[PDB]
Design a protein around this ligand. Structure first.
Ligand SMILES: CCn1c(CO)nn(-c2cc3c(C(C)C)nn(-c4ccccc4C)c(=O)c3cc2F)c1=O
Ligand SMILES: Cc1cc2nc3c(=O)[nH]c(=O)nc-3n(C[C@H](O)[C@H](O)[C@H](O)COP(=O)(O)O)c2cc1C
Ligand SMILES: O=C(O)c1cc(=O)[nH]c(=O)[nH]1
Ligand SMILES: [Cl-]
Ligand SMILES: [Cl-]
Ligand SMILES: [Cl-]
Ligand SMILES: [Cl-]
Ligand SMILES: [Cl-]
Ligand SMILES: [Cl-]
Ligand SMILES: [Cl-]
Ligand SMILES: [Cl-]
Length: 366
């Protein structure tokens, strides 16, 4: 453990979170990150953390999940934290305010958060201009193993969900290494019903035709991000559609609308998606089931409750090629990124893996 990891986790983050409302803490974090007001990322990425997937090199397999940088304001600062890849969004076609405040709740006793932001978004036009300002900087970052993902959502009042996603592909597809069709927010009425077989096949056919229409150097991978709350039937149907259409990957999982037994936080019964420690194993077991249903042939980005190298390696061994985190950053701060990478490298060596690639899906081969 570095001096910074202990100071941030034991003193600085609890002090700052105790002084700020949770949404004010989020907004300030995006500000600090965009300005590069960050502790030194001491950790040097080794060859054994490199992953080749989704048509790209990833210098390390630890990404920032969607929701932290919804509007693409802090991308360069997130690479400066030591993330191997950055995902921005969700972005909606038109700007929208999201839900009324309060809409994000801390459960420190559970190392969890509940949010009901409701896709607060600057909209595609603003994010398009923000990414265009650094488009060639991003091309050089991607070539250097630091890809960019863009997560697409839909407007609250949209009548045609598929047209909202198509508009996102058109506008931000040319600026992205991968796109995410986010059909798993718990905080937009009817959105999760787009995970159903008939609705998903129609939606994803339209998204893939739009993506295929982009010029080659501007043609991103397309991933579907799924809920942790799916039935066995829902998961079987998603696996079938992903293989039928040649979807490039899955992000597993979004936040849960479940409230696992044992939550202690006073705010446990707030409406919204639960993230952090209580989601971790529900996410890992969703990765495990989606890897099996897709015969290990569909790359998975594993997300939900990662705050250590062990958490990351459990998702990799379950079938994830890459992992993301968000909620751990609210408790540990920026040093968590180097912490997870150092612990993951040590565990790969201890368990006899040559690198991350050798560990992907290893549990299925036992
Ligand atoms: C879920 C909403 N949500 C919450 C509330 O649940 N917190 N949160 C958050 C806050 C912070 C904060 C603030 C405490 C100032 N600061 N820093 C930091 C510290 C020192 C130096 C450089 C930075 C960016 C972080 O990294 C950081 C990350 C975060 F995710 C965040 O997105
Ligand atoms: C405040 C907050 C906002 C989020 N917003 C989004 C979003 O816009 N799009 C999305 O696909 N996921 C969103 N998520 C979900 C995260 O990307 C992630 O799937 C989930 O929080 C589990 O990871 P974690 O336990 O490491 O936070 C959000 C999560 C949080 C905590
Ligand atoms: O905007 C939000 O409320 C949001 C979107 C999403 O996909 N997941 C989440 O937990 N919140
Ligand atoms: Cl590849
Ligand atoms: Cl709170
Ligand atoms: Cl425009
Ligand atoms: Cl372009
Ligand atoms: Cl295609
Ligand atoms: Cl079921
Ligand atoms: Cl429940
Ligand atoms: Cl809820």
């Amino acid at each position: 453990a570095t001096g910074d990891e202990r100071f941030y986790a034991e003193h600085l983050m609890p002090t700052l979170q105790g002084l700020l409302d949770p949404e004010s803490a989020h907004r300030l974090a995006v500000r600090f990150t965009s300005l590069g007001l960050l502790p030194r990322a001491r950790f040097q990425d080794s060859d054994m953390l490199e992953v080749r997937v989704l048509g790209h090199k990833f210098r390390n397999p630890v990404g920032i999940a969607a929701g932290f940088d919804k509007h693409g304001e802090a991308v360069d600062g997130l690479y400066k934290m030591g993330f191997g890849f950055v995902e921005i969004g969700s972005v909606t076609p038109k700007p929208q305010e999201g839900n009324p405040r309060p809409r994000v709740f801390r459960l420190p006793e559970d190392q969890a958060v509940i949010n009901r932001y409701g896709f607060n978004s600057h909209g595609l036009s603003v994010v398009e201009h923000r990414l265009r300002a650094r488009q060639q900087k991003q091309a050089k970052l991607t070539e250097d193993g630091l890809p960019l993902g863009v997560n697409l959502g839909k407007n609250k009042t949209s009548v045609d969900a598929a047209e909202d996603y198509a508009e996102g592909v058109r506008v931000l597809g040319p600026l992205a290494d991968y796109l995410v069709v986010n059909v798993s927010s718990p905080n937009t009425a009817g959105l999760r019903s787009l995970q159903g077989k008939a609705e998903l096949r129609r939606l994803l056919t339209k998204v893939l035709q739009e993506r295929d229409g982009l010029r080659r150097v501007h043609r991103p991978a397309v991933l579907v991000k799924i809920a942790p709350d799916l039935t066995s039937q829902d998961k079987e149907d998603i696996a079938s559609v992903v293989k039928e259409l040649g979807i490039d990957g899955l992000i597993v999982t979004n936040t849960t609308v479940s409230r696992p037994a044992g939550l202690q936080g006073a705010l446990r019964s707030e409406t919204g998606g639960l993230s952090g420690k209580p989601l971790r194993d529900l996410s890992t077991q969703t990765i495990r089931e989606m890897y099996a249903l897709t015969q290990g042939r569909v790359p998975i980005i594993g997300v939900g409750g990662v705050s250590s190298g062990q958490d990351a390696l459990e998702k990799i061994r379950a079938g994830a090629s890459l992992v993301q985190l968000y909620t751990a950053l609210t408790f540990w701060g920026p040093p968590v990124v180097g912490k997870v990478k150092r612990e993951l490298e040590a565990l790969l060596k201890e368990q006899g893996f040559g690198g991350v690639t050798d560990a992907i899906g290893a549990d299925h081969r036992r």
